[PDB]
Amino acid sequence: MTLAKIELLKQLLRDNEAKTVLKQTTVDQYNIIRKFNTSRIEKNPSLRMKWAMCSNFPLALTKGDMANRIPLEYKGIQLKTNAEDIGTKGQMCSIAAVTWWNTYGPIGDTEGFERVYESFFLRKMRLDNATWGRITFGPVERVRKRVLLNPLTKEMPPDEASNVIMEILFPKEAGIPRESTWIHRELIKEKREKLKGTMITPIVLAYMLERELVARRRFLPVAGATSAEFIEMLHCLQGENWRQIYHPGSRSQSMIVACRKIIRRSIVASNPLELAVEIANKTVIDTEPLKSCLAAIDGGDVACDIIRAALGLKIRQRQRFGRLELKRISGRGFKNDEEILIGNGTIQKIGIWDGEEEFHVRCGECRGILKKSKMKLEKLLINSAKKEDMRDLIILCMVFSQDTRMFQGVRGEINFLNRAGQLLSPMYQLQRYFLNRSNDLFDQWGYEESPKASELHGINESMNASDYTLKGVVVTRNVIDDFSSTETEKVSITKNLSLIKRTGEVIMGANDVSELESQAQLMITYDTPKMWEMGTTKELVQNTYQWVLKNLVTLKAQFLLGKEDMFQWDAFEAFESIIPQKMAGQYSGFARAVLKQMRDQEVMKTDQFIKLLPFCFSPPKLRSNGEPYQFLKLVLKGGGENFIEVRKGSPLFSYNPQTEVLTICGRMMSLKGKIEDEERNRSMGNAVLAGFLVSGKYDPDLGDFKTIEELEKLKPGEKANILLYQGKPVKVVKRKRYSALSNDISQGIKRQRMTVESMG
Amino acid sequence: MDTFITRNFQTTIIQKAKNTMAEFSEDPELQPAMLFNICVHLEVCYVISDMNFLDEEGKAYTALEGQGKEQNLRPQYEVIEGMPRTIAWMVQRSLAQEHGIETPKYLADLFDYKTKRFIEVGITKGLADDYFWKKKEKLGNSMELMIFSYNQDYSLSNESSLDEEGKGRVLSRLTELQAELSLKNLWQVLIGEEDVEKGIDFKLGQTISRLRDISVPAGFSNFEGMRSYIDNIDPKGAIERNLARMSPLVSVTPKKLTWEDLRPIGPHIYNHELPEVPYNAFLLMSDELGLANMTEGKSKKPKTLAKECLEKYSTLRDQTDPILIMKSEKANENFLWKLWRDCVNTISNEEMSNELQKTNYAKWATGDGLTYQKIMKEVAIDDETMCQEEPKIPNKCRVAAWVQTEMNLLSTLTSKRALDLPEIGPDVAPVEHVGSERRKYFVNEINYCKASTVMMKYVLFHTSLLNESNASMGKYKVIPITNRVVNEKGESFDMLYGLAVKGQSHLRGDTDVVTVVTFEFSSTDPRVDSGKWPKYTVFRIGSLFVSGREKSVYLYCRVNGTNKIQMKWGMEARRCLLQSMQQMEAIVEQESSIQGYDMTKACFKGDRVNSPKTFSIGTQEGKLVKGSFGKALRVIFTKCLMHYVFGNAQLEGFSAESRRLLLLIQALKDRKGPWVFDLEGMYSGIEECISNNPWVIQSAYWFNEWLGFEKEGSKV
Prior knowledge:
Helices cover 35% and strands 16% of the residues of chain A.
């Protein structure tokens, strides 16, 4: 076929038009060339299809050897014709041959469908094992929401999706893997292995992968659950006047906690942005940096939005004040400084918004419309969603509106701080005061007659659907749908993590995050010593072991040399904090002696090496004679379960060699085995053309090009002649290491700021 | 471009580039290419300075990451680029003094401790050598030079300053940036560190500038004048100034609308001086006579089916002496009778071919030859008698009587059912069980109404017509008007309702017309009401016994014409069924909203707790009458079927414009006090569509009657 390709190319070039266009349009311009089709689209597909199905041979068969399997006329029925074609240059055929092929003919392979169409079979599995329930014929309240129509294996932006698809099913044309294949290495290797052994046309697989990865989101009327699993069946579950019970056949909380922790860590220091981004791109959740679920979900908690702004990602431009999401509708508010006496008797100089304004307001499950004038709230319309959410909405909108009544309702004091110990602006101090004491401005706010009307009904201070409501507040028994035109407009990030509009206006403040702690439902493994000196001993041990495991190659290489520089690593200094001071030195000496014996009089043993390395950070204290002390049970801070077993394993550390697996702090990790062989198996994902850098031009000294398989044969540091993307001959050099541009940039910034401080 | 910068660069590098631009008073937004260049410069400098350290002996070496060595860990390269200008200058001076080297006259980018030199890093889109020489000339030999280009080539003052890995990595980053820019098409738009001070160039020529000059609003004489006026002048109440002088004779004329203002639409239908509306539908609806033959169930070609159906009725098949009951106005009795005889002979012929054997008599029977011959424009210009035909407006007719009778008759149950639907998969969810129950309750009602049989007959006829037209283009064809009818006992009768000659359908376009002549069996003698049949030439081809009661059998012959559009819509007329169900579904659902359980059995037949649902369906002697749920569903289905069959431009113009009055009446019934601006305008718009469409005239009549009913009932 390659000979047929070259012959077709020569015949095409024989014409001068082909010669001039080919030599004129670069590879990039090819797209334009392709789009110059006739565009004589059929005006009515129904009539065309109806007419074609009645024709003798409407099917357009591609020229090939398949036709010989079937006669041109079977059982006196015409199937295919040998007449030439001009539209497709193939042959003609009829649905009769298609039906015969479905009846008889070659028998193909059934394996490919088990995994290739994984999403469809997962849909069928979720349908089959689903459990149905009763039907509620009563009216259903539905809200218009931006929902993901179908579940995704790993949500990623369209460009990353395309790059991943190419890296999966297009081994060639993979020049310079970006900072996206390493993030999705597991997906790359999984899909690569699954799709290997097939014969389907590559475009079908590419489109299916695009469906399986690229997100599809739409505005839909929903009531109840919102996960894609329920959205798949929304056509049956929901109903204007009927509802059905359905149960189809995590990382979010962990990312919330991690982002909050990063925010708190970075704020306390100066220049928070650089430190925050360093920790964010140096963090990982069990297989991937934080830019694998942050980039997945749309928006999220204020901390996640601030981190995404610090990183490179798109965030919804809703104004976050405390918990309120505000979307301006009209009016311009002039922020002018003014001196106002607070109900406590003190006088504060703060910014007030002159002029009328209106905002769509959201908080948890509560939606509403707020209309406010300067120093006064005017109107508020809400729907009954939840007592807690409604109370939060009322109080937060009250504080935001800066109503004089809210100021006159203060009774305690405003001198609070955050977990980092900083004094906030009076607005957020008032927010915290009122949220802590909800029954402070509610009592003195004043009451208003109930909204006498067909549906409008009031709500009292206790959040019960009781009449004699608050002044201004109204609850309508309808559906309020808000937050249209999510433009994701351009937003800047200041050093202090506080976002601002295209203009100087501030949208998100550094203190919007709520100071609420939780437990990471996943292994939050960072890569910087500064971060993890907060949590418990178990977390410290887990993070230190993860740090050791990640960069196992470097530590193993340094082990062979046999120098103390290997042991004086900052990563273990935090570990020193969780070892008893009176006995840490003995542990260090014992472990140093054991590891010296390991290097001298035996061979590689990764498990014990990892177990014993970290304890040697502290200086040793040998026996009076000089020999090292011997132990078999390393006690840790907290006692009891916080202890390491030298021989086989313990609650915090146990490695089984029968299956060669590692369990650290109750978490199983796969140590396929030992050896650079297992190192390369770990590297079994990565990306084609990941171990080679670009240097130089064609350089014909090497003759013709060489394939990836022949490329691997070259020893490190060689020069090879390869083709990049669609052609583009270049010269490449095999890499001797693995790179991390983010680490380099972070270290450069650290050195720069160290220099700045030292000069200062 | 800024989006690419945000995506491909860290926020830190962007901040440093923005700070550098601010120091120079250069706006990053107005020069995004320059911002990208500065970001790339900072990134390459950081990439060069990373990973490189000096051992105690002073030999360059690599140091691992995340693995500190006490405090010093002295790096090979100290980055100077990115610091504030004052701080960078002071750092350069401090390094020069400390190492006893000359202070460069120009600020440096990096400093190498090993060589103890100041290194300048440059980038370019052109050849590395050219940029290297330019930078050397500008700066001199006091600073080492390292220039990298996007085409994988570089110029280094010293080849040992950077190892293979560093140059390879910087080149890989540059190539990735270039590829991403090309994919985003920013590469060509991107302009390097020598052209980024120019900006885009797009200047207007002479003709376009003149067109802009003369295309300025009144009062201006040049587009520069308009531009200055728009940019400078500020209106501060121009709208009120214009309104303060605009004449008070312009206004919406807001008038409140009451019941009395609403009057019957299209009073001319009542007038008896106008002719009775004729039957212009494609096929007979309430008069079809089904030549029914019991069949085992085998589906056969329509030609064979018609052959057998005529074979059963030998008297009508062999009838050859017609009795003209009426020749309408223009058609010729001889032509139509001979054409019908040829039809019968072709159908009853032994050969399977269903094409007319004459091919010449039909040419004049169908009037194909009675067409004008087109000449060239010149002769038409020269000739004086070649005028333009005056437009033919539709006749202004009156309310007929056959439309009401057909509306009644097509909406009644019949023992015969034809509408059958394909099976669907088993229903396992409760929701689909409820849906199946509702669907069964609906089809048990619709299937037995005659309107369903008429709809199926229309659909089958149009499907067969389309198939014949596509298969046969330039030959006259014979087409039976076939239908299949299953009785309650399961006997699958095949019904022949007549024949039709199809003319020559060789048409490239869709709007082109194709002529067909329809002969239809019927049991109705037109003399009973001759006003309904002014378009039909009929015979009396015999009589038949259904059960012992002899009834005549006539043949209605008429020439007509269709097109591929209506021809397709014939097979899409089944959607009426959907329109019949949707609304009723909603109705039922509303009931279900009231009380919790499912009512589809209650609304249809009722239960011990709820009475059967009854609508208002008809009237008699001025007394409105109720009607069961099934009867209301039948009425809606027949309304949809008529909306199809009698559909044309007039029907659309009538419905889409009388909806205004429908919504106004709905608002009035809710006491919203609707106001109107020009009522007579809406009434004229509506009534300029009641010309000759029977369904439009009957819709107007029923609208007037229902409006009278609403007026009389509004008293409460």
